Each structure stands twice: as C-alpha cells, then as structure tokens.
Design a protein around this ligand. Structure first.
Ligand SMILES: [Mg+2]
Ligand SMILES: [Mg+2]
Ligand SMILES: [Mg+2]
Ligand SMILES: [Mg+2]
Ligand SMILES: [Zn+2]
Lengths: 98, 122, 147, 38, 148, 216, 130
RNA sequence: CCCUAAGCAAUCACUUAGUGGAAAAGGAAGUGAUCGAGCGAUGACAACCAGGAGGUGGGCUUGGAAGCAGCCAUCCUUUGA
C-alpha cells in the first residue's frame, strides 16, 4: 500500500506525458525530435492525469523523491516564460526579456 | 487553510480552564483569510455549563467525520492533522476521477529488490 | 462588511464644485470607480457649507463599485496657515520662521477638529498637542501670547 | 557562480554551506549571489 | 604636512641609514591623547606616506558619506603618525657600488602599541566602520581603541 | 563633616566587589612571568607615611579574571577614582585572612598590544588620609544646548581633572551641565561643582570645553 | 518596564472597581475598538484595557478578585468598571452588539462578589435596576 | 611498528586535516577549555495565527512625490502596538 506521494506539473505548448506499461514506464514529449523514456524503479509507480500532471506514487520515500527530481531534471523551468516541468507548489519567478 | 472542510462543530465549557486550544482554533477558523476561502463552509459554536469536555468534531467534503482531542492537543496540531488527512482525501479524489482504482497497491517486496539509477533515454 | 476591500484613496475637493473631470478624472478612473453617484452624494451634503473650501474626502474603493465614505474636515495645514497668514512653508522648518500663533487659534482649531467622525473621544489636550506637532513641521513659531 | 577567496553574505537570503569540504554561499532570491571559496 | 602627502620640507641630511624596525614596544601602555576613538597598531613595522594618506582619505570619505549637512565636518581626525625617513633606490641595469642611490619616498617607523589615528565627533558605529575601512590600506595589524 | 553632600553622585553598589589576593615572595620578571602564566596579576600594597624605606609594602597577586572584569565594566579611568576592599589571605580557599584594608588602585598597567593586565598598584587609604586623585568628567545636557542645536561642534579639551581628595568623599565622576552654553563660550576648571573640602591642583583658569562655531 | 506599566494600569483601575469582565476581540479593528472604548467611557463610568493574561494573573494575586483564574484564556480585552450601575454598564454592550451586528465578540466571564457567573447567568442581573 | 640496534612503552588531555609532512593579507565558523553579559517560567528564542493606526497627503521641491528621487523637521495622541 502506497504512502509517499509527489506531484509534477508540465507547462508548455505541445509538451506531453504518458504512462505506458501498468504505471512502470514513463514517456515524455518535450519539444525534441524524439521522445524521452524513463523506467520507473521498483517500489514506485507513476500516473498521468488530464491537467498535464504526473504523479509519482510509492512506498519508499527516498526512491519516490529521487525519481520525482529525476523526472524534473529532464527539463527545468526556464526563467523567461516558465516553460518546462516543475513542482505543483513550486513558484517560478520570471523576468522580462529585452 | 479553509478549503477542505464543510462543517466544523466546536463545543466547550466556558468556566473550565482547558479551553485555550479550542478558542485558539476558533481564532484560526474565524479569520478574515479563512471565511473568504470557503463561503459555503459552516461553523457551529456550542457552549454549555455542564462537564462535557471540549471537543472539535469536523466533517469533510466526502462524508468523512473526524473527532479530535481538543482538551490535550493544541489547535496548531489540529490544523496540521486536518490538512494531513485532507491532502490524502484530495489525492484519492483526483485518482478516482481519472479512472484509477483506490487505494493503489504495490507489492511490499520490492523494498528488498535492488534498483539501478534512472538515466533518461531517447 | 464581507466585501474584499481593494484600496482606500483620499482626495481634496472644493466645496460645491463637484464637477467630475478636473480632480475626479484619472484619480478615480485609475481604480475603475464611478463618477456620477459619488458626486451626487457629495453635492447632497455640502449645501450648508461655505464654497471654495478644500474639503477632505476619503473613499474606500471596492470590486463591486460601492462607495462607503466619510467626510473629513479641511486639512490642519490649511487651518493653521489660513488663520495665520501667507500659505508658503519654510525652506528649512524648525529654524526658519514664517508666522506666529500663540494659544488661541490652535485651541479652537482643535475644537473644530473634534468634529471628525472618528474623533468623538480624543481629548482636547491630545488634539492641541497634535496640532502643535504639525505647527513645528512647517516652520511657524508658537509663543505664550503674541503682543 | 562567482569564485573568489573571500565569500560574504550580500543580503538576507544568503546561506553558507560546507559542501564536500568547500565553502559555498547559496542564495534563494538573487542567483547572482552564488559564490564559491577558491 | 604639505597638504595631503606628508613629509618634511627639508632635512639635515639627504640620506639616512636603514636602521631596524622589527622590534620596539610602548613600555608603559598607550592611551588616547586627543580623541574618543582611535586606531592603534598591534605589530611593529614600516608604513609609507602614501598608505597613511590613503587611510586618512578613507576615513574622511566615510564620514563624508555617513554624515552630511552641518555635522559633515563635526567628525575630527588626528593623524599621530608622521613619515620622516627617506628611503633610497638604484634603478635597473646598474652595478653594485658607485655610492648611494637617489631618494624615492618616505616611510614611518611604527612600534607595537603606537596610535596611528584618532577620531572624535562621530558615532561609535561610524568610528568602528571607518577603522575597519582604514585598516585595509595598511600592511600592519591594527586594533580599534576606545577611551575609558 | 566627612560625608557626601546631597545632590552629589556616590559609588555604585553593583561594582562594590572585594579583591582577593595571596602573598608573593619575590620581585622580578621571572616570578612575574610565572604568576602571569599561572593566571594571576602581580601587585603591591603600600602606604604613604614612609616613602623611603619601602613604605610597609606587601607583595601580593590578584586574579586576572576579576581584575579584567572590573576594568572592562568600569572603564580605565573610573576604576582609578574609586576605593575598594582588599582581602589578603594565605591561600585561595583558606580562611587565614592576613589583611583586610580599604585601598585605592593607584595605577594599573595594561599591555600596549594585547591589553592584558600586567601590574596593579594599591595604596592604603583609611579615613583621614589625603590623595591626589584624577577624576573623570561626564558631559550631560548636550541635547539642550542652544549652541549644539545651531549646528556647532563640541571641543572637549580635557577629560580628567586632578584633585587633592580626602579618602572618604572621593567623587566617582563629575557631572558637567551643558544646558546653557551657546556658540563661543567655554567652561574653565573653576566651574566644577565639587565638595568644598576638595582642593584643585591645577589653576582655575584652565579651559575644559569650548563650543566653537561651525563652517558656514 | 511594561510589567510596571500594566501593574500601574490595573492598580489605578482597581481603586473603585466592583466587577470585571473580559471580551473576545476577534475580528474587531482599531477604530471599532476605539468606538467601544468611547461608548463605554463617556456613556458609562468604565474603562477598557488589553493586557497580558499572566500579568493580570500575577497582579490580581492577594486580592478578592482571585476567583477569576479559569477565565483568562485566548483573546481577552479586560473591562474594569469603577461604578455600580450594572444595568447601564451591561446594556451598552447590547446596544453596541445590535447596532454594529457583531456576534463574534461576546462577554466571556465576569466576577461579582467572589463568584463567576455564566454568560447566561449575568443576563438577568442587568434587568434588576437599583 | 618494519626498513634499522633498541618500547604496537605507562598516565591525563587534544586533531580526523594524511594536519603532522612547505607559503601571507583575507574569508568561513568545525571542535574543545574558561571569564562575563542580555533575555527567562512575570513564559524567552524557533514556529503558527491576527493587528501593525490617527493629525497626515508634515512642509519645501514639484509634470509627480503621499513613509520610501532630493532638503528640512522627525513632533503629538488613542493605545497592547
Ligand atoms: Mg630584581
Ligand atoms: Mg629491530
Ligand atoms: Mg603536508
Ligand atoms: Mg597554513
Ligand atoms: Zn543573496
């Protein structure tokens, strides 16, 4: 039974996520020509919802938080328009571009 | 703080000296930043002279009632545990709306299994 | 009440001249406020007062365009400069002197200032010493008795 | 990252942390305040 | 005096022996003579007149920006160290002995516990921070001293 | 008439400690360095009556932490214009009290670089004895002064005044009132409000503080 | 220093006092607090003070107002009344409450003659005059 | 200790940098020993909540400065602030 939970929000024009095999494989589309495949480790599963939200659900806190940061590290938020993957409660502070 | 509750019932004795936590929760729940966040949420204050101990009994949106020991636990600990249960309820509802079964079960043997590092792949 | 207070903006308008364009233009248009009903309510009360008097109006703006205002007496700088002499403040107050008022003008100005709608209970010593502190701040002299 | 021999805290959100035996100054507000002793 | 840069207008002799400066203390303790705060030395060594002028300029420029108006010159500075020893020097591409070289500058011999600067007419925090700014221009180790 | 008059300051009861000492058997830099390494300040207690032939001197050593605490809390000059109780016993923790006496700190030596105490001097001042005491000054009323209000700056010419004082009424400090001084004037040493039994050693026509005009 | 301030502030107010109450000032602003203080200062012979509960606790020791001890928790605005006319003392809060529509700020606890009446109990005693 | 003849010598403390086993001005505050001070059960510091006012938009400057471009003053009051 899962206890430790983490949520991620994806912001971007044409940026997409999809789970593949029982919540054990994660696939991502981040504007490249190819896609990004990550294998969710044991004790953690992944889920995708209809607000461009990715849920990391699991029983080991270390693996859950490490894998959530792993998914985040594929694309950090940019400072000029906030596009990328970020945490749900995380505030991204923008700046104007000359 | 007031997003997840539907009805709160506070009950206490006014001449009994353990009302500090319950009136502090009254201060927490009757603020200006609270009632604008849920206009539909209801508060219920009851006072009595007899010796029923001070209690906080709350309900949530999804029909779950929770009673707390307002005599011996502080209002801030109450405020932390209501949100600790509330976010679990929200996660349950967010999973249930999308068609996933709740609760999700993971075999409790993969804690012993070795895991390599997750390197992103093309 | 229960409405989410947005801002509290103040202004000074001469008495009787509540024509909503020279002071009631961009000052109230910056916060989406109306110009008709506030001016009607303003002209519906300054009929018993002397005109061309800088009456102070604080207006609490809202998100539902509702006006809940009280009317203040004209400014104590106006009351302590027009009952004294020239309306020009000093270049260096506290050291450079313009006018002089002894004991009496400040006291009756305090009596008039007591009519503020939330000054029902402040004592006259408090109001008089507040006006003395204002009098120190533009450079006018105060004495026991001018002769 | 600004690397120098005299790291300082230039505002109120700067923190000194010893990472791998080296002194770092990390800031949450201004990313121009990130310093490393060396 | 000579305005900013301090050295004697004339001397008895043009060239002086090197001497020793690495020793010497004030054998009776030190106390402030004019001011309320001051900067004194903890070590013994040499200071050049350019360094002394830079330290004095740093203190007066810190007071200039901290306090303005009629209190701008309320701060008073005393320089109690004076540079009156000429030092010499031979240029490049010269052999060892054909006399003694031309003078190049002036130094001051500073002992352990000698008061270099004295300050009055300012705040305690302004005096401490001006001492902090001035000690970064001197090669010796200095301490802030207070009247008591 | 050997008591402080009203309207005058008195020594504080916060800093009225007693100074503990143990005897010292020799003089010189060897035993001085040994006592300083062990954590004691060398000292001598002497009297006035026979300046030649020593002066009934006794060589003692006091505690560095206590002496440093007293100097830091009082100030250097304030410590030197105040009487103390000295209690000399044969050992630390012993009850064999050799001499309890009321004494003046005549001087204290501080290192010029590290400011650790190196030597304390005590002179026996029972009642009825005359001393030359250097009293610090305290300047008050600098917010009331019209000259300081007008932007003039303060020129403190002297900080301490030397007096001839009987032991019982030695003032800890002299309060100098600056309420009624405008630009141009100075206070001389004859304007100090002291006890009438104190005699001023310096001449009375010596300036103490002058308020000089600012740079217009 | 503030301990001495509020010790004096209660020592002056206890010189003619005959009953003591404490009001929950949750949601009251500065201007409405000043208006309550004004109404109860001109129209009656009462005084208002917001003070440290433990300091009033220590400053009422050794006095006949020693029974109060349960009723000093939370947000407390202490009202000290130097007069005897409790109908005019307690009907002013009724007029204040019904005029400015403030149900969140009520009278919790009062001390009269070594007794702590319930808030329901000091409702009939305002009906009896003199 | 072995290289290398003779002690993994005995008692009490300290460092975890291979410091020991090269180098300053300056920086950071790890780890001990000791002397004071300040606050503190009248409730401190960390934490959470709710206030944080009025004369007043203090005047001068000034297309505009209202606590926050610059100059002068920096007072007074209700208060728990
Ligand atoms: Mg000898
Ligand atoms: Mg061998
Ligand atoms: Mg090495
Ligand atoms: Mg080194
Ligand atoms: Zn920073």
């Amino acid at each position: 039974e899962a206890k430790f939970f983490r949520f991620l929000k994806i912001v971007g024009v044409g940026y997409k996520a999809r789970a593949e095999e029982a919540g054990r494989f994660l696939y991502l589309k981040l504007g490249y020509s190819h896609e990004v495949e990550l294998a969710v480790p044991p004790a953690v599963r992944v889920f995708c919802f209809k607000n461009n939200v990715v849920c990391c659900t699991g029983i080991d806190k270390d693996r859950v938080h490490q894998f959530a940061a792993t998914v985040r590290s594929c694309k950090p938020p940019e400072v000029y328009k906030g596009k990328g993957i970020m945490y749900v409660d995380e505030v991204v502070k923008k700046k104007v571009g000359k | 703080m007031l997003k997840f509750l539907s009805k709160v019932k506070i009950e206490f004795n006014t001449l009994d000296p353990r009302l500090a936590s319950c009136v502090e929760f009254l201060a927490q729940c009757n603020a200006r930043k609270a009632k604008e966040s849920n206009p539909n949420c209801q508060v219920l204050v009851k006072r009595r002279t007899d010796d029923q101990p001070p209690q906080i009994s709350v309900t949530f949106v999804n029909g779950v009632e929770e009673a707390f020991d307002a005599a011996a636990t502080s209002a801030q600990s109450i405020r932390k545990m209501i949100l600790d249960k509330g976010q679990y309820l929200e996660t349950e509802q967010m999973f249930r709306e999308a068609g996933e079964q709740w609760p999700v079960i993971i075999p409790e043997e993969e804690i012993h299994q070795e895991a390599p590092g997750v390197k992103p792949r093309k | 009440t229960r409405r989410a207070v947005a801002g509290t903006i103040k202004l000074t308008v001469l008495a009787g001249k509540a024509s909503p364009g020279p002071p009631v233009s961009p000052a109230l248009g910056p916060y989406r406020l109306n110009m008709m009903a506030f001016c009607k309510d303003f002209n519906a009360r300054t009929q018993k007062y002397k005109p061309d008097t800088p009456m102070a109006v604080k207006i609490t703006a809202y998100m539902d365009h509702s006006f809940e205002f009280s009317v203040k007496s004209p400014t104590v700088s106006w009351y302590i400069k027009k009952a004294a002499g020239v309306d020009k403040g000093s270049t260096r107050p506290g050291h450079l002197t313009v006018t002089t008022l002894s004991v009496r003008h400040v006291y009756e100005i305090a009596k008039v200032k007591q009519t503020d709608p939330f000054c029902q209970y402040m004592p006259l010593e408090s109001i008089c010493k507040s006006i003395i502190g204002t009098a120190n701040s533009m450079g006018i002299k105060i004495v026991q008795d001018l002769e | 990252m600004k690397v120098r021999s005299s790291v300082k805290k230039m505002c109120e959100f700067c923190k000194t942390v010893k990472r791998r035996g080296r002194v770092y100054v990390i800031c949450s507000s201004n990313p121009k305040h990130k310093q490393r002793q060396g | 005096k000579k305005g900013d840069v301090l050295y004697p207008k004339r001397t008895k002799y043009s060239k002086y022996r090197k001497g020793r400066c690495s020793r010497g203390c004030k054998p009776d303790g030190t106390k402030l003579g004019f001011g309320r705060y001051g900067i004194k030395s903890c070590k013994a060594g040499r200071l050049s007149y350019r360094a002394i002028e830079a330290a004095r300029r740093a203190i007066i420029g810190h007071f200039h920006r901290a306090m303005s108006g009629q209190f701008r010159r309320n701060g008073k500075i005393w320089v109690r160290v004076f540079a009156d020893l000429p030092i010499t020097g031979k240029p490049t591409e010269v052999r060892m002995g054909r006399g003694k070289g031309n003078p190049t500058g002036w130094i001051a011999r500073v002992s352990t516990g000698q008061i270099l600067f004295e300050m009055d007419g300012v705040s305690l925090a302004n005096a401490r921070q001006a001492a902090t700014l001035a000690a970064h221009k001197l090669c010796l180790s200095t301490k802030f001293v207070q009247w008591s | 008439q050997l008591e402080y008059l009203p309207g005058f300051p008195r020594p504080d009861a916060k800093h009225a400690e007693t100074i503990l000492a143990v005897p010292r058997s020799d003089s010189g830099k060897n035993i001085s360095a040994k006592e300083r390494k062990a954590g004691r300040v060398p000292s001598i207690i002497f009297e006035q009556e026979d300046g030649q032939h020593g002066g009934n001197k006794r060589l003692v050593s006091v505690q560095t932490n206590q002496i440093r605490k007293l100097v830091t809390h009082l100030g250097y000059s304030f410590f030197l214009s105040r009487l103390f109780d000295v209690e000399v016993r044969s050992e630390i923790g012993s009850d064999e009290v050799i001499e309890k006496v009321r004494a003046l700190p005549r001087s204290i030596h501080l290192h010029s670089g590290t400011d650790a105490p190196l030597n304390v001097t005590f002179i026996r001042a029972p009642p009825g004895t005359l001393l030359k005491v250097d009293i610090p000054l305290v300047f008050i009323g600098d917010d009331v002064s019209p000259g300081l209000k007008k932007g003039a700056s303060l020129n403190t010419i002297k900080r301490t005044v030397k007096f001839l004082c009987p032991a019982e009424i030695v003032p800890p400090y002299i309060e100098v009132d600056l309420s009624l001084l405008d630009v141009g004037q100075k206070l001389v040493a004859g304007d100090l409000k002291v006890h009438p039994a104190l005699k001023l050693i310096r001449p009375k026509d010596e300036p103490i503080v002058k308020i000089a005009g600012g740079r217009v | 220093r503030r301990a001495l301030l509020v010790a004096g502030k209660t020592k002056i107010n206890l010189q003619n006092c005959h009953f003591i109450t404490g009001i929950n000032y949750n949601g009251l602003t500065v201007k409405q607090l000043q208006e309550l203080r004004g109404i109860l200062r001109e129209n009656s012979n009462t005084k208002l003070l917001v003070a440290k509960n433990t300091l009033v606790f220590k400053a009422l020791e050794g006095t006949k107002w020693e029974s109060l001890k349960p009723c000093m928790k939370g947000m407390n605005a202490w009202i000290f009344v130097q007069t005897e006319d409790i109908p005019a003392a307690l009907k002013t809060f009724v007029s204040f409450q019904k005029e400015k529509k403030l149900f969140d700020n009520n009278l919790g606890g009062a001390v009269f003659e070594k007794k702590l009446y319930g808030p329901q109990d000091y409702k009939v005693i305002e009906t009896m005059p003199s």
